[PDB]
Paper text:
Bromodomains (BRDs) are protein interaction modules that selectively recognize ε-N-lysine acetylation motifs, a key event in reading the posttranslational modifications that constitute the epigenetic code. The closely related BRDs BRD7 and BRD9 are part of the SWI/SNF nucleosome-remodeling complex, which plays a crucial role regulating gene expression programs, including the expression of inflammatory genes. Although BRDs share similar acetyl–lysine recognition motifs, there are significant differences in distal parts of the binding pocket. Owing to a shift in the ZA loop in BRD9, this region is much larger in BRD9, with residues A46, F47, P48, T50, and I53 forming a large hydrophobic cavity.
The C7 position was viewed as an ideal attachment point for a structurally complex heterocyclic appendage that could exploit this cavity for selective inhibition of BRD9. Furthermore, analysis of the BRD9/1 model suggested that a C4 methyl group on the quinolone would occupy a shallow hydrophobic pocket, thereby increasing potency. Changes in the melting temperatures (ΔTm) confirmed that nearly all of the elaborated quinolones were tolerated, and valerolactam 6 was selected as a lead structure for further characterization and optimization. Co-crystallization with BRD9 showed the conserved H bonding of acetyl–lysine recognition: Compound 6 exhibited H bonds to N100 and to a conserved water molecule. The valerolactam moiety extends into the desired hydrophobic region between F44 and I53 whilst positioning the amide carbonyl near, but not in H bond contact with, Y106. Furthermore, the introduced methyl group at the C4 position demonstrated additional hydrophobic interactions with A54 and Y106. ITC confirmed the activity determined by the DSF assay: 6 bound to BRD9 with a dissociation constant (KD) of 612 nm.
Residue numbers in the entry: 22 to 134
The structure:
C-alpha cells in the first residue's frame, strides 16, 4: 500500500467517522430512493471511493476531494433540506473541505520534504 494510498485511506477514515450510520457507505438504489438514478446521473459514495483507492485510481488529493464533493452535492440535490441526509451531507462537506484545505495540504507537503 503506497504513500498516497495511506494518506487517502486516512482522509477517508476521518470522513467516514463523521457518518456513524453509514448513510454514505454504499450506493443509493432506486428501490430505497425513488427516481435517484434519473436525478443523480453521477452517483458516488464512500465504498466507491474506498474501491478507487484500493485500485490505485486516484492521482491526487484534488481528485479524491472532487469525489467527496460529488457525493455531498448529490445528497443535497436529491434530498429535501429537512432530511437527515441533506443535513449530514452539508455538515460533512464543510468539515471535509476544512480537513483537506489547500493550506493544510501545503503544510503536509512541507513536512514531506
Ligand atoms: C433515500 C436516501 C437518500 C440519500 O441521499 N442517501 C445517501 C441514502 C442512503 C441510503 N443508504 C445507502 C447505503 C448505505 C446505507 C444507507 O443508509 C439509503 C437511502 C438514502
Amino acid at each position: 500500500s503506497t504513500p498516497i494510498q495511506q494518506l487517502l485511506e486516512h482522509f477517508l477514515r476521518q470522513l467516514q467517522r463523521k457518518d456513524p450510520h453509514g448513510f454514505f457507505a454504499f450506493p443509493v438504489t432506486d428501490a430505497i430512493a425513488p427516481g435517484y438514478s434519473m436525478i443523480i446521473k453521477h452517483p458516488m459514495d464512500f465504498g466507491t471511493m474506498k474501491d478507487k483507492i484500493v485500485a490505485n485510481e486516484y492521482k491526487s488529493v484534488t481528485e479524491f476531494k472532487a469525489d467527496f464533493k460529488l457525493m455531498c452535492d448529490n445528497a443535497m440535490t436529491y434530498n429535501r433540506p429537512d432530511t437527515v441526509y441533506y443535513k449530514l451531507a452539508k455538515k460533512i462537506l464543510h468539515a471535509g473541505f476544512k480537513m483537506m484545505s489547500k493550506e493544510r495540504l501545503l503544510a503536509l507537503k512541507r513536512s514531506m520534504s
